[PDB]
């Protein structure tokens, strides 16, 4: 299963020039492009090997569009400030995310396009790629403007067309990396936390993609009480890490097992102290 | 590949 996602952030800085605009693009859990309004290149830039092969027409095109994205966001900041009756003095944020999913069979699975103002939902394209979900009266004004200009249709065409088309092209051109699965390297550690209790920490390392399920069990049964799960995190080499811990009573560690599920594994793994 | 243009709010 696969996805392409673009994330766009603009942040106004009242007394200090035009908004900071940062754009990043991903294919699954792999970043492949970026743009930073403050950076020197003023170009869309590569961040994956397989995208560098793309010709200068690609780079010129993506750099024109990403810049137009930021200029449009620059307008939004002014408009939203008006919609909400806010002062010139405060820094505010707009975020746009859009992208598309394909099945394991490479056929179109779903599209999305949503928008937030100061970190909360403002407006979003519904799953039918035809209609809009608008939070408040401001977002309703936006909703009507967008319905009127058939924005959902333009977006539908992109998500079902170009989006999935270039996701596929990227997945081909970079198959050697994007389509490999790195199964998690796995182990358990043990810490005595008190006279009578120990923590068991179950580790998953250098796995890819990021999707993974670590669960604990007690006597072959799912267990949540006293379990701690951290956010899946980047190792920085393109792979991911995660751990899950339980606090058990000392001398009962044999009762517990950790189970690991991951696309790269022939089958789920079990670990015990 | 970026959408050709985005809508202002």
């Amino acid at each position: 299963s696969h996805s392409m996602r673009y994330f766009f952030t603009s942040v106004s800085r009242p007394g200090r020039g035009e908004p900071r605009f940062i754009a990043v693009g991903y294919v699954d859990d792999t970043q492949f492009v970026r743009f930073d309004s403050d950076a020197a290149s003023q170009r869309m830039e590569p961040r994956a090997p397989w995208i560098e092969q793309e010709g200068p027409e690609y780079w010129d095109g993506e750099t024109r569009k990403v810049k137009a994205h930021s200029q449009t966001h620059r307008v939004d900041l002014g408009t939203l400030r008006g919609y909400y009756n806010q002062s010139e003095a405060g820094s505010h944020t707009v975020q746009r995310m859009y992208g598309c999913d394909v099945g394991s069979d490479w056929r179109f699975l779903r599209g999305y396009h949503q928008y937030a103002y100061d970190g909360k939902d403002y407006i979003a394209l519904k799953e039918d790629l035809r209609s809009w979900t608008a939070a408040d009266m401001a977002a309703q004004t936006t909703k009507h403007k967008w319905e009127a200009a058939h924005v959902a249709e333009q977006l539908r065409a992109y998500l079902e067309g170009t989006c999935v088309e270039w996701l596929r092209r990227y997945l081909e051109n970079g198959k050697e990396t994007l389509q490999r699965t790195d199964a998690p390297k796995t182990h358990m550690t043990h810490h005595a936390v008190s006279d009578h209790e120990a923590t068991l920490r179950c580790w998953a390392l250098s796995f890819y993609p990021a999707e993974i399920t670590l669960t604990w069990q007690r006597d072959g049964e799912d267990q949540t009480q006293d379990t701690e799960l951290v956010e899946t995190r980047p190792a920085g080499d393109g792979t991911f890490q995660k751990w899950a811990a339980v606090v058990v009573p000392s001398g009962q560690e044999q009762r517990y097992t950790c189970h690991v599920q991951h696309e790269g594994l022939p089958k789920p793994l079990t670990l015990r102290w | 590949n970026l959408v050709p243009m985005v809508a202002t709010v």
Partner: T-cell receptor, first 117, second 108 residues
Framework: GAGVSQSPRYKVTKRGQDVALRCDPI?????LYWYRQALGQGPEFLTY????????KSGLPNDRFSAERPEGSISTLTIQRTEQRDSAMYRC??????????????FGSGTQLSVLE | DAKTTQPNSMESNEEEPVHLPCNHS???????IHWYRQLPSQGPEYVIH???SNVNNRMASLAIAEDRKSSTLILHRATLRDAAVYYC?????????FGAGTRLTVKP
């Protein structure tokens, strides 16, 4: 102002000399375009701005042509070392904002530039 | 090269309908169709635009083919005042690039 304003309406410029053409867009319009138009042809795209930023200048025919919009309002198109070939109707246009909402283009009266040897 | 295609000239009688044809065979679902007109001695001005639905306003109707490969600007009752150049524009990013248009003459 309420409408797109260009000055001078007409201009005779001696070939080899520079000329500056002014566009005042509709107040608050983020986008500004420059076109030029020859007899029996449609407008030829020259350059386009969003605020102060020149987002596309692929249409500028050569290094003698340059445009600026220093404060995101007034734009000046300067042609250095004019050639007869530069003679044309120079047309400014503005629209409220860039993007999929397709804010319509508003066109000005234009500047008839005639470069004479 | 050019993205729309139009007859260079055309003529019709006053107080009768005008169908102004445009071709844009190589078009995407993200390409909008715009029509602008240019009256004598004036600059271009917006007439109508749309995506896939037919459009109607006070000045005209926009008829878009099912396959979106051609379109028609309809002047329901052209007056002499409607003689002008009509431009058919294909656009997906606000480039707003103009072709040579169709020059309409309205016979009295």
């Amino acid at each position: 102002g309420a409408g797109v304003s260009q000055s001078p309406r007409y201009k005779v410029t001696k070939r080899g000399q520079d000329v500056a053409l002014r566009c005042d867009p509709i107040s608050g319009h983020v986008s500004l375009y420059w076109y030029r138009q020859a007899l029996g042809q449609g407008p030829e795209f020259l350059t386009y701005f969003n605020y102060e930023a020149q987002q596309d200048k692929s249409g500028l025919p050569n290094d003698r042509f340059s445009a600026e919009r220093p404060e995101g309002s007034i734009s000046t198109l300067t042609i250095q070392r004019t050639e007869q070939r530069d003679s044309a109707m120079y047309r400014c246009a503005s629209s409220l904002a860039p993007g999929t909402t397709n804010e319509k283009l508003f066109f000005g009266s234009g500047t008839q530039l005639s470069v004479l040897e | 090269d050019a993205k729309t295609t139009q007859p260079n000239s055309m003529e019709s009688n006053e107080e009768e309908p005008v169908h102004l044809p445009c071709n844009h065979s190589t078009i995407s679902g993200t390409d909008y169709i715009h029509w602008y007109r240019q009256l004598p001695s004036q600059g271009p001005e917006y007439v109508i635009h749309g995506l896939t639905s037919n459009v109607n306003n006070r000045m005209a109707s926009l008829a878009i083919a099912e396959d979106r490969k051609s379109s028609t600007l309809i002047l329901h009752r052209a007056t002499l005042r409607d003689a002008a150049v009509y431009y058919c524009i294909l656009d997906n990013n606000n480039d707003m690039r103009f072709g040579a248009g169709t020059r309409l003459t309205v016979k009295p």
